[PDB]
Design an enzyme around this catalytic site. Structure first.
Site, PDB file in Angstrom:
ATOM      1  N   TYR A 286       1.412   2.527   2.866  1.00  0.00           N
ATOM      2  CA  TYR A 286       2.091   2.290   4.172  1.00  0.00           C
ATOM      3  C   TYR A 286       3.521   1.783   3.916  1.00  0.00           C
ATOM      4  O   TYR A 286       4.437   2.107   4.689  1.00  0.00           O
ATOM      5  CB  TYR A 286       1.273   1.348   5.075  1.00  0.00           C
ATOM      6  CG  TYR A 286       1.207  -0.102   4.658  1.00  0.00           C
ATOM      7  CD1 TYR A 286       0.101  -0.610   3.997  1.00  0.00           C
ATOM      8  CD2 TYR A 286       2.227  -0.985   4.962  1.00  0.00           C
ATOM      9  CE1 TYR A 286       0.018  -1.946   3.642  1.00  0.00           C
ATOM     10  CE2 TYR A 286       2.166  -2.321   4.606  1.00  0.00           C
ATOM     11  CZ  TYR A 286       1.058  -2.797   3.943  1.00  0.00           C
ATOM     12  OH  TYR A 286       0.997  -4.090   3.553  1.00  0.00           O
TER      13      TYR A 286
ATOM     14  N   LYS B 288       7.809  -6.226   7.433  1.00  0.00           N
ATOM     15  CA  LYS B 288       7.200  -4.971   6.962  1.00  0.00           C
ATOM     16  C   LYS B 288       8.309  -3.944   6.684  1.00  0.00           C
ATOM     17  O   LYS B 288       9.132  -3.692   7.570  1.00  0.00           O
ATOM     18  CB  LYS B 288       6.168  -4.442   7.955  1.00  0.00           C
ATOM     19  CG  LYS B 288       5.558  -3.114   7.522  1.00  0.00           C
ATOM     20  CD  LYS B 288       4.421  -2.623   8.386  1.00  0.00           C
ATOM     21  CE  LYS B 288       3.966  -1.260   7.893  1.00  0.00           C
ATOM     22  NZ  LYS B 288       2.856  -0.701   8.694  1.00  0.00           N
TER      23      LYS B 288
ATOM     24  N   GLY C 117       0.846  -1.206   0.000  1.00  0.00           N
ATOM     25  CA  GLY C 117       0.000   0.000   0.000  1.00  0.00           C
ATOM     26  C   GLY C 117       0.870   1.242   0.000  1.00  0.00           C
ATOM     27  O   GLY C 117       2.066   1.112  -0.315  1.00  0.00           O
TER      28      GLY C 117
ATOM     29  N   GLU D 223       5.249  -2.203   2.391  1.00  0.00           N
ATOM     30  CA  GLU D 223       5.062  -3.574   1.872  1.00  0.00           C
ATOM     31  C   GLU D 223       5.263  -4.549   3.012  1.00  0.00           C
ATOM     32  O   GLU D 223       6.095  -4.267   3.885  1.00  0.00           O
ATOM     33  CB  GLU D 223       6.113  -3.899   0.820  1.00  0.00           C
ATOM     34  CG  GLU D 223       5.962  -3.080  -0.432  1.00  0.00           C
ATOM     35  CD  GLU D 223       7.125  -3.197  -1.406  1.00  0.00           C
ATOM     36  OE1 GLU D 223       8.164  -3.838  -1.047  1.00  0.00           O
ATOM     37  OE2 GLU D 223       6.984  -2.638  -2.523  1.00  0.00           O
TER      38      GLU D 223
ATOM     39  N   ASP E 259      -6.338   2.371  15.360  1.00  0.00           N
ATOM     40  CA  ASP E 259      -6.596   1.984  13.946  1.00  0.00           C
ATOM     41  C   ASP E 259      -7.053   0.523  13.908  1.00  0.00           C
ATOM     42  O   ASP E 259      -6.568  -0.243  13.049  1.00  0.00           O
ATOM     43  CB  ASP E 259      -5.388   2.235  13.052  1.00  0.00           C
ATOM     44  CG  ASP E 259      -5.693   2.129  11.564  1.00  0.00           C
ATOM     45  OD1 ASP E 259      -6.883   2.348  11.174  1.00  0.00           O
ATOM     46  OD2 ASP E 259      -4.737   1.839  10.827  1.00  0.00           O
TER      47      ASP E 259
HETATM   48  C1  LIG Z   1      -1.551  -5.618   9.364  1.00  0.00           C
HETATM   49  O1  LIG Z   1      -0.218  -5.411   9.818  1.00  0.00           O
HETATM   50  C2  LIG Z   1       0.755  -6.367   9.638  1.00  0.00           C
HETATM   51  C3  LIG Z   1       0.489  -7.642   9.138  1.00  0.00           C
HETATM   52  C4  LIG Z   1       1.529  -8.570   8.956  1.00  0.00           C
HETATM   53  C5  LIG Z   1       1.199  -9.931   8.445  1.00  0.00           C
HETATM   54  C6  LIG Z   1       1.534 -11.028   9.241  1.00  0.00           C
HETATM   55  N1  LIG Z   1       1.239 -12.282   8.865  1.00  0.00           N
HETATM   56  C7  LIG Z   1       0.627 -12.490   7.700  1.00  0.00           C
HETATM   57  C8  LIG Z   1       0.253 -11.430   6.878  1.00  0.00           C
HETATM   58  C9  LIG Z   1      -0.470 -11.792   5.633  1.00  0.00           C
HETATM   59  C10 LIG Z   1      -0.059 -12.881   4.871  1.00  0.00           C
HETATM   60  C11 LIG Z   1      -0.776 -13.218   3.730  1.00  0.00           C
HETATM   61  C12 LIG Z   1      -1.884 -12.502   3.323  1.00  0.00           C
HETATM   62  C13 LIG Z   1      -2.573 -12.964   2.088  1.00  0.00           C
HETATM   63  C14 LIG Z   1      -4.093 -12.738   2.173  1.00  0.00           C
HETATM   64  C15 LIG Z   1      -4.784 -12.524   0.823  1.00  0.00           C
HETATM   65  N2  LIG Z   1      -3.964 -12.950  -0.318  1.00  0.00           N
HETATM   66  C16 LIG Z   1      -4.682 -12.565  -1.563  1.00  0.00           C
HETATM   67  C17 LIG Z   1      -2.709 -12.210  -0.361  1.00  0.00           C
HETATM   68  C18 LIG Z   1      -1.897 -12.277   0.924  1.00  0.00           C
HETATM   69  C19 LIG Z   1      -2.324 -11.396   4.086  1.00  0.00           C
HETATM   70  C20 LIG Z   1      -1.613 -11.048   5.237  1.00  0.00           C
HETATM   71  C21 LIG Z   1       0.556 -10.111   7.229  1.00  0.00           C
HETATM   72  C22 LIG Z   1       0.176  -8.949   6.281  1.00  0.00           C
HETATM   73  C23 LIG Z   1       2.817  -8.201   9.299  1.00  0.00           C
HETATM   74  C24 LIG Z   1       3.058  -6.911   9.802  1.00  0.00           C
HETATM   75  O2  LIG Z   1       4.342  -6.530  10.140  1.00  0.00           O
HETATM   76  C25 LIG Z   1       5.457  -7.370   9.942  1.00  0.00           C
HETATM   77  C26 LIG Z   1       2.051  -5.982   9.920  1.00  0.00           C
HETATM   78  O3  LIG Z   1       2.273  -4.685  10.391  1.00  0.00           O
HETATM   79  C27 LIG Z   1       2.397  -4.434  11.795  1.00  0.00           C
END
Ligand SMILES: COc1cc(-c2cncc(-c3ccc(C4CCN(C)CC4)cc3)c2C)cc(OC)c1OC
Ligand SMILES: COc1cc(-c2cncc(-c3ccc(C4CCN(C)CC4)cc3)c2C)cc(OC)c1OC
Ligand SMILES: COc1cc(-c2cncc(-c3ccc(C4CCN(C)CC4)cc3)c2C)cc(OC)c1OC
Ligand SMILES: COc1cc(-c2cncc(-c3ccc(C4CCN(C)CC4)cc3)c2C)cc(OC)c1OC
Lengths: 284, 292
Positions: free
Chosen positions: B15, B31, B13, B17, B129
């Site tokens: 934000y 992140k 986004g 990646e 948030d």
């Molecule tokens: C919100 O925030 C943070 C989230 C994460 C995080 C941790 N585990 C798994 C994820 C994830 C994995 C895979 C998908 C899929 C779902 C749909 N598909 C179509 C594409 C992808 C979505 C999400 C994430 C995004 C890490 C963060 O920091 C290291 C974050 O920030 C604090």
């Protein structure tokens, strides 16, 4: 997509205090310095990290930043600051194993003034103005090219307390205008004047040099109290001794006048880092 | 061992990646923040310095790094990886039975109560948030709350409030009325907890829609999907929440089911325009502990 080699080999400990430890480390064959903070001094890691997250300072006379690392442990947080490694160590350490000629004494003090004027000056477009608040010979590193760089921005202010030996009178007597950023620049200039005195003593003239001594070595104990320093600096208004032998040498005569103009009781009478640099470029 | 391999981008986004990476054979989330959100990185680092933050329903911290050479800075947060992704993702591909619906929402309430309540340690923490994209689904059926970049800290014990230094604001769609009309009392910790309860109510509504009753289920929809433009602005949200006084509609089929009837009552007590009338996170957790 890509490997992130994060392994730093910690090879030898080059510093230990209450603050924590500095290690000579190896990253990808390349020496780095690793400051490992005590939990007690976590705020210095946070303040330096917040500063570098605001402005990526890059200056030949500022210790070069590489990384801030927080790693989660079982029941604690490990805080590392990683920087350029200067194998010659601190100016404090260096002044105790050599004397200086005129060229090397001027190169040292002008490099410290350049680093300090860079901190102090606001640049638009740039950087905030920064005051160091703990300038001393232990927080200055010697480089192989004979210039120095300023280290330890854990107390820095942008627009823990200072080492007591180096505190300006207005800090010891609590009259410092804490809502005036200029007040913090004036405190650094006082400390700069004491570092100038520490270096000038080790400059040889007509076969004579002074032994390395810390500022006020003759009037305060080791680990002086706040009271010990206030009585010397504020009540009696003592200043470091200028030896007679300096007045035979044109460089040390000009440097005595300079350090005197850093030690006025009135902070607003003190020279600026920019004016010190100009004076040093006209010496010799 | 500190060496990390970046294997694929799981999110992208303004934000920054997020990458799935490998670190000591294990999956990790990395992140990489945009320089435009440097203040969120630092704030998240401050929050994960709290050793009693660790909780089964809070995204587990591994490391934070700021790295620089010349004028280029990289900002890394490394966390545990959840391969099922965010609640927002999961709710689009599955319906829920009663047991799974309550386990999800109780686990989110349990994480939020953990944030909100001071431990005499850990300060009291307001998230600011909360949303289904900031909640990750775990293989045990519970969720964990992610993204502490906007968080506010408070200690009653030392009478300190740390609102931090971040011009970032909450996701528009989930903003409380007092956030959208800018009357929120900025020096009052209780204000920030009450903003979280509003958002929590919206998440409850998103989840409950996906729980089947009597062979009926709603499609996944975000809060206020029906009343604002796509990609709603701050002013769009202020119109519906503040001027029009809209709240999410309760599907009438919910009233046939005891669980959804109880959840409808709960989410409506998250949605009072008077912030002080809203339920606490602890009350929500106790109510969801008793609902079956
Ligand atoms: C919100 O925030 C943070 C989230 C994460 C995080 C941790 N585990 C798994 C994820 C994830 C994995 C895979 C998908 C899929 C779902 C749909 N598909 C179509 C594409 C992808 C979505 C999400 C994430 C995004 C890490 C963060 O920091 C290291 C974050 O920030 C604090
Ligand atoms: C996380 O942690 C540490 C990381 C590193 C490190 C190691 N390899 C490569 C890097 C790197 C730098 C910059 C990019 C660019 C490339 C693409 N561009 C468009 C944006 C980003 C990518 C990768 C880094 C930052 C070293 C460390 O120690 C010295 C780390 O730990 C403190
Ligand atoms: C002031 O503070 C910080 C300093 C440093 C730092 C950077 N380069 C080199 C040094 C150093 C190296 C070696 C010796 C000795 C050991 C070998 N030989 C027997 C004589 C020389 C002394 C000193 C240091 C201590 C890093 C920091 O952060 C990572 C500091 O903190 C901000
Ligand atoms: C933290 O420190 C060190 C880091 C590195 C390092 C390792 N991988 C990748 C990088 C890198 C590559 C590319 C960009 C830019 C290029 C221009 N634009 C397109 C944006 C992206 C940035 C960074 C670096 C700088 C090496 C170092 O020394 C050899 C470091 O010092 C110890």
């Amino acid at each position: 997509q890509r490997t992130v080699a994060r392994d730093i080999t910690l090879l030898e400990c080059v510093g230990k205090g209450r603050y924590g430890e500095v290690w000579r480390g190896s990253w990808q064959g390349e020496n780095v310095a690793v400051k490992i903070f005590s939990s007690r001094d976590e705020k210095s890691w946070f303040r330096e990290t917040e500063l570098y997250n605001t402005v990526m300072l890059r200056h030949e006379n500022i210790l070069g930043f590489i990384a801030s690392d927080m790693t989660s442990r079982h029941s604690s947080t490990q805080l590392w600051l990683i920087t350029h490694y200067h194998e010659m160590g601190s100016l404090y350490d260096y002044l105790q194993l050599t004397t200086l000629d005129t060229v090397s004494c001027l190169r040292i003090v002008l490099s410290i003034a350049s680093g300090l004027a860079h901190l102090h000056i606001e640049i638009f477009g740039g950087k905030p103005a920064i005051a160091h608040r703990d300038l001393k010979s232990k927080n200055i590193l010697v480089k192989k090219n004979g210039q120095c760089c300023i280290a330890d921005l854990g107390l820095a202010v942008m627009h823990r307390v200072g080492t007591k030996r180096y505190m300006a009178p207005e800090v010891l007597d609590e009259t410092i205008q804490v809502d005036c950023f200029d007040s913090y620049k004036r405190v650094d200039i006082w400390a700069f004047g004491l570092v100038l005195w520490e270096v000038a003593r080790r400059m040889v003239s007509n076969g004579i040099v002074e032994d390395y001594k810390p500022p006020f070595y003759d009037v305060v104990p080791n680990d002086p109290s706040f009271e010990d320093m206030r009585k010397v600096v504020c009540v009696d208004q003592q200043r470091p001794n200028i030896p007679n032998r300096w007045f035979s040498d044109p460089t040390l005569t000009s440097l005595a006048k300079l350090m005197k103009e850093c030690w006025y009781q009135n902070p607003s009478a003190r020279l600026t880092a920019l004016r010190i640099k100009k004076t040093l470029t006209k010496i010799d």
